[PDB]
Amino acid sequence: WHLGIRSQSRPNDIMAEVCRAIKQLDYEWKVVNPYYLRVRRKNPVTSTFSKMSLQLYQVDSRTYLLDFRSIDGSHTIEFFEMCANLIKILAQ
Template identity: 35%
Template sequence: SGVAILPTSLPQLHRANMLSSGLLQNSNIHPLVSKKSKTKWHFGIRSRSYPLDVMGEIYIALKNLGAEWAKPSEEDLWTIRVRWKYSGSNQIANNEANNSQNQNNEKIPDLLKIVIQLFQIETNNYLVDFKFDGWEDSSGAPVTPSDITSDEISAFSAYPFLHLTTRLIMELAVNS
């Protein structure tokens, strides 16, 4: 095959040629770093604060962001069931119709639910976990998936959930 890689296009050779040919006026041009630090992922967010302080900070952040939550049960103080009016849905409603229904007359639920739970990993090391917990409609109407085949049951957009968790993490970061 006549397919080949042009030798003079390889970065190292190009730089050598530029230096030897005297064409280089601007000598402080350095190559982009090719070793990219791999993104290190964690579950949720870590904390070494006192557990009750962590919960207090989360409740304050949720309040500042206008979220609401169910009163925690005595036996489970470390779980918060949050409901959040998602502004994006109003916007969609305005875009597509006035009464938050789109052309196919489908309800666009606007209350995103999240479960926030505090776990102890080891002594003085805690993890705040965020889980998506479905949608509700502020009018109280049940959110029923439209009649779709079982194959498509999982066409699910995580972006509203991801967006609201970034808002909460920002609020916690700013407050702390």
């Protein structure tokens, strides 16, 4: 079981990428921190809002860790789906 996803690129690019990704998804975001975000998304089908928080940690000398955290249809499953879409774009 792996927490979040990883990248050995540069924090500038990593964050730059997520925002580019967030944009394609047509997701609302808010930079609370150079490396800490806050995302929203109205549900096209149920017409409700679901929000998560991104946060880039650092694990070792050259590796980085992007953390997804849910924020208080189905809340839980939609949280999985929001992430799944992001991780898909990032993985391209």
